[PDB]
Design a protein around this ligand. Structure first.
Ligand SMILES: Nc1ccn([C@@H]2O[C@H](COP(=O)(O)O)[C@@H](O)[C@H]2O)c(=O)n1
Ligand SMILES: Nc1ccn([C@@H]2O[C@H](COP(=O)(O)O)[C@@H](O)[C@H]2O)c(=O)n1
Ligand SMILES: Nc1ccn([C@@H]2O[C@H](COP(=O)(O)O)[C@@H](O)[C@H]2O)c(=O)n1
Ligand SMILES: Nc1ccn([C@@H]2O[C@H](COP(=O)(O)O)[C@@H](O)[C@H]2O)c(=O)n1
Ligand SMILES: Nc1ccn([C@@H]2O[C@H](COP(=O)(O)O)[C@@H](O)[C@H]2O)c(=O)n1
Ligand SMILES: Nc1ccn([C@@H]2O[C@H](COP(=O)(O)O)[C@@H](O)[C@H]2O)c(=O)n1
Ligand SMILES: Nc1ccn([C@@H]2O[C@H](COP(=O)(O)O)[C@@H](O)[C@H]2O)c(=O)n1
Ligand SMILES: Nc1ccn([C@@H]2O[C@H](COP(=O)(O)O)[C@@H](O)[C@H]2O)c(=O)n1
Ligand SMILES: CC(C)=CCC/C(C)=C/COP(=O)(O)OP(=O)(O)O
Ligand SMILES: [Zn+2]
Ligand SMILES: [Zn+2]
Ligand SMILES: [Zn+2]
Ligand SMILES: [Zn+2]
Lengths: 368, 368, 368, 368
């Protein structure tokens, strides 16, 4: 009997960009789940645990695994996770190590009894420099994952010290015995931008996601009217909680809703007002930065500004242009339309204005 | 002179799932039309007739063929269809037999005069058991399609008896003579889930379909407020015709509209009220079940609830969660936003509430 | 030192259809930019100039190149463009010549000094007929592109005469010396429909574009009510500026907005009224004709007609059918829903009606 | 009723190298037969005639076609060939035009009655120069093949004049009417080295051919002993008919025998002695030049020199080296062994010496 831990928590700008690597799309599945799915196919684990910096989101993708909140470091994470494990044995692995082959798994498990922790390793044939200083290459081992370990010893191995980079050194530094099985190129750890092209990773699925956004604001506030952060009119201002950009909030909602990241108020509520100031376009940027973190990319934006006045004709290239700049996309993907309601309803009576945004999101093309 | 009948009517849960197999997408075309297109390329038929359990829908896909309503059985269907045929000869084929090669067609037609009905057949080299009891394998024939038959004889062959599974046995059981041309693996009949991977079928096109949905309901009804079938508030009910779920009807429309299946009222009208009760979420399920039958699958849902009150914040994970369950999709594909209209208009005055749904549908990935 | 001119202006129905060929999608990039990108990768040009019949649109795709308005002919265009060039040398090329290989470029530039203009050429081994009359095939040269020319001489070569088809004959007809480097099949000029399948062109990207459309019209005009150009009711007309088709204008906006071509008023404004008459469905056709010109194609239309009356039930197949005909798409891609607002708001009070359109556009599949 | 002529005669160093292009291997078949096979699949021709500069060789490849000896020119060839044709119609084609598609054939034959000769043609979109001088490109036609012609008129069309490059101009120059069907890129004429990579030609089959060679010469001739044209010994000469190189003749036979080109005496007989002089290595070169002409290339040579004396040890790198140079191959492909017969038999008694050559030939890799 043996359980599995997938360590998928933390986050750092090594690989990273604006997009977390556990959230890269390989097929329909995000990396973290792709990896967990792959390992989980190999063996009936008594329990599967996944460490996370994003439990609530992660959870919306499956019901199969127990999720435990990550720690400050890999070991910290792993300790926390082990406390949920009662099987005699445990197999721990990095999600970043996506394409671990069944072959290698069989090699690990066929040596289950020889020592206290079992590990893939590879030799090094190149001149190795530790700090611009030569090292005897034959004595080097590159250590991979998964690693199978006796639960009881691993829990104890991490009672005090939490600086260990892998299970093997942890078990080792407590007197335990280590068994080195030959590793493989498929077990590489996705750490740098450059690594992506070095792995036979499935390119992301072609699904496109839609989002809508609707927002209303009351007229009659003596300040400038800002839409997509372009100044439309010096006094015909909107009675808002921020700088009053109905366009920008409408669009924000649409971008969020497409990513299943709620709506604008779940992020930037009217109750707390460090948002009193609020440059809405910046709030929009930040909204998109969240969508980008979970592996999404805007295809296009279509906006429809419902307002009886003022005539937004002259300002429409300026609005499209500013969105493009803020959200960092080519100008052609942005389109701002406008319409009166022919004097009908609150919009037509001039009580306020509304904006209707429409968006499509694709999964980030990580093939550069 | 020779006409063509494509038998594409009926329906049964042999292959089936929630999706009719004539509606599977192979390229841009649904199976039934893909198959009819393929056969129709091979020969200038005087008339092409397609039997259907879905004329009105089927018709929206071409203007080339005459459609006749199907019968209770294959023969029943075929009789009905022959009554539209005046050419001396007729070629009948199952749509389910998609990839019939030009080669085999040439073999059929090059033997047009030798007998009364001409048919593909294959021998069997395996031990064959009729009812767990061995049968002399050499005496067996697996009969395929198309089959060319002399119209006059086929019409007569089906005057009384309608139990016949293919044209050959029908012509045969009336004294007529049958000619067996060698069949092929491409002429296989798509009957079971498992068959799909046994055929070199073109994978479905990557087109995504959009849908919008808008619905309004009046406030002031002393009962609970249900949205996506989650109870929001015990008394602030909506004045509806059913349980009053504006969300669920708005979403229903969007799912229907994306599939070109009309709107909610074309299915579930306010006139007839066996819908007086009406659990709207179940009506939604049923709506989706129609969309699924014609080869579609939801990518994502984005909903925007326009309501001045109550504050739906606390209930948004519960709404998303319930939709996911009802429509049987992963939770991450559902997003429910909400907005007041800042006291403006009927929504803002609290007269009623509106919901705006946005959806994308992809063609069903039948590669499992 | 050497600058680059990409000639991408003009337009004619040689290749053409309803779609301009510089706007065909090869990867994410339109042809003109794909081609300019390819050449621009080969050498650090001091200045890159692109000639255009569409500057404003073209500009929304990059910030890298200087765009100058095209002339009536290729030479006219080229003269205009040279006036922006101060480098000693210039390389001119047709955008239509998309896949020009690095190899051939190296051949051009490695012969930079031998003469006044350097050009790819190919021999002809077939019987050649000039006007059904045989010509000595060995004496023929098919002239390609790019061509490198000494700026000063090319400017002068086009001072008077502007009938020249390529740089070489222009330089030649002024006494200058021409150097013929062997051309290639990749440097072919995309001129006819048939040429597409003769080039290894990257198929278009799979991105889908969304568009929304909203339009309102006031009731109480004694004439017929036209929606999608189907007559709904003989007297319950809308107070419009044209024939009053709210559906058709709503849809027009959506189709435009998806293509980033603004909104309906940017095309067909209420100020000028040669649109007084206005058959809106024809205006819609024309709108789509613009979207088609820039490489887009409708996947589907979903429309939601907000109107308290009249009951549009009986007319919904007729509306879908008429749109299909006007926009020239299969009937199944069109869906018209309708909803009252349960007597609430201006719509529900019967003051006017609104329509909400939703659309998805894909890039034109030029593989036929 | 219609017959086919494949013109495969003549030869020139346009494409050519050391290898005739009708003899290039595409699959197992040489080009000429590959092409004839392709056209012959398309239609039951009453008679198939192939013109040849190599009847006797050509004949060893099939029994299906009538072969007639070629003329000095293409027309000369074609006249000669027509005299074997009695069908009303004839289709003539260049073998060099290998991959003519069924599609295009159907286009030719579906216009069989409209005029006197029917021909594929393509337009030209490039600037065309006739003798460095511009020509109105729209008036140009590139003429392809096949061409269908009325036999009677074609025979007459070539009664006097034989300078015509294709059937169309010949029929035309006699008043007959010409019909131009659109041609294709697959109908290109393989004329230049460079053309090969422009056609989707099947790469040659992987068959290897073996050859053996045995030759004996009597000792006791007061001159130098030459083997592979290296001087072995100043006086121990062989009593030959030429310079006496037993090695070189043995190897010649082996190279010929592998190519089914007979033996050395069929080329260079002892009766005629302009071979009295005879530098055998040059005769060997020439032998290989024949093998090269019919599409073959040496993989390796293994030679075994049976001689009781002299000891050839010191001269074996020099022999291998000289063969390599003569036959123009890398040195590693040549190996010369030697053996006495331990004083037994004529060899061992020193009456003469024998040489046994072994060779493998592959088909020329025309992919450069
Ligand atoms: N605090 C941390 C740090 C890393 N990890 C995971 O451990 C694996 C290996 O860690 P590093 O990539 O940081 O070396 C990664 O897949 C990462 O997601 C974790 O679960 N908790
Ligand atoms: N009925 C409503 C209206 C608004 N809200 C929330 O309040 C936020 C701010 O709403 P307004 O912009 O309409 O003031 C929204 O983003 C939404 O999260 C809600 O939860 N229920
Ligand atoms: N009542 C029926 C039953 C079957 N059929 C068609 O006949 C073909 C063969 O029938 P079975 O698959 O039911 O044997 C199928 O393509 C099916 O669509 C029909 O047109 N009408
Ligand atoms: N103007 C209208 C309004 C509604 N309807 C139909 O009536 C149905 C119910 O509409 P309400 O939900 O607006 O009462 C809709 O689904 C639509 O089919 C219509 O056909 N014409
Ligand atoms: N007036 C014109 C005509 C053609 N051109 C460009 O010159 C190139 C070659 O011209 P033609 O295709 O018209 O021969 C094309 O890529 C076309 O876009 C231009 O830039 N201005
Ligand atoms: N506030 C507004 C309202 C309308 N417009 C423009 O006026 C045009 C006609 O608007 P109506 O249909 O609302 O009269 C729209 O297409 C839009 O270009 C605008 O520029 N600013
Ligand atoms: N004397 C000749 C010259 C050419 N030909 C054939 O005619 C075809 C076209 O001729 P050219 O390639 O010489 O133009 C070639 O396939 C060539 O083999 C012939 O059969 N007799
Ligand atoms: N004429 C000869 C005969 C033999 N030899 C060499 O002497 C070796 C032994 O030859 P026997 O086996 O014929 O005695 C051969 O392998 C060959 O290298 C030679 O170099 N010249
Ligand atoms: C698709 C969408 C969101 C359409 C909005 C159009 C609409 C129903 C306006 C209501 O009018 P109103 O509330 O301003 O009328 P009044 O305030 O006079 O009652
Ligand atoms: Zn707001
Ligand atoms: Zn409702
Ligand atoms: Zn309008
Ligand atoms: Zn000899």
């Amino acid at each position: 009997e043996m359980s599995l831990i997938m360590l998928a928590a933390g986050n750092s700008t090594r690989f990273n960009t604006k997009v977390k690597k556990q959230f890269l799309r390989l097929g329909n599945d995000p990396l973290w789940l792709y990896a967990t799915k792959n390992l989980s196919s190999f063996y009936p684990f008594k329990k599967i645990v996944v460490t996370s910096s994003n439990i609530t989101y992660m959870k919306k993708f499956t019901k199969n695994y127990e999720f435990i909140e990550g720690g400050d470091t890999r070991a910290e994470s792993l300790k926390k996770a082990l406390e949920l494990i009662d099987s005699e044995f445990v197999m721990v692995s990095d999600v970043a190590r996506v394409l671990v082959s069944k072959n290698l798994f069989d090699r690990l498990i066929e040596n289950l009894d020889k020592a206290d922790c079992i590990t893939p390793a590879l030799k090094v044939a190149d001149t190795t420099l530790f700090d611009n200083e030569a090292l005897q290459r034959e004595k080097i081992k590159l250590i991979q994952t998964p690693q199978i370990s006796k639960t009881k010893l691993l829990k104890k191995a991490l009672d005090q010290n939490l600086e260990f980079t892998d299970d093997s050194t942890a078990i080792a530094a407590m007197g335990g015995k280590i068994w080195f099985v030959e590793g493989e190129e498929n077990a590489r750890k996705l750490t740098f931008k450059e690594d992506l092209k070095k792995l036979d990773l499935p390119t992301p699925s072609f699904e496109i996601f839609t989002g809508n956004g609707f927002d209303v604001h009351e007229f009659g506030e003596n300040r400038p009217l800002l839409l997509a952060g372009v100044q439309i009119h010096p006094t015909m201002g909107l009675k808002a909680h921020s700088d009053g950009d109905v366009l920008a909030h409408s669009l924000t909602d649409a971008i969020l809703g497409a990513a299943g990241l709620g709506d604008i108020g779940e992020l930037y509520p009217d109750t707390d007002m460090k948002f009193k100031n609020a440059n809405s376009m910046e709030l929009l940027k930040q909204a998109y930065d969240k969508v980008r973190e979970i592996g999404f990319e805007l295809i296009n934006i279509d906006i429809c500004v419902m307002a009886q006045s003022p005539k937004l004709k002259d300002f429409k290239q300026a609005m499209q242009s500013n969105i493009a700049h803020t959200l960092d996309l080519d100008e052609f993907r942005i389109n701002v339309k406008a319409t009166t309601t022919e004097k009908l309803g609150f919009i037509g009576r001039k009580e306020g204005m509304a904006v209707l945004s429409s968006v499509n999101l694709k999964y980030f093309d990580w093939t550069r």
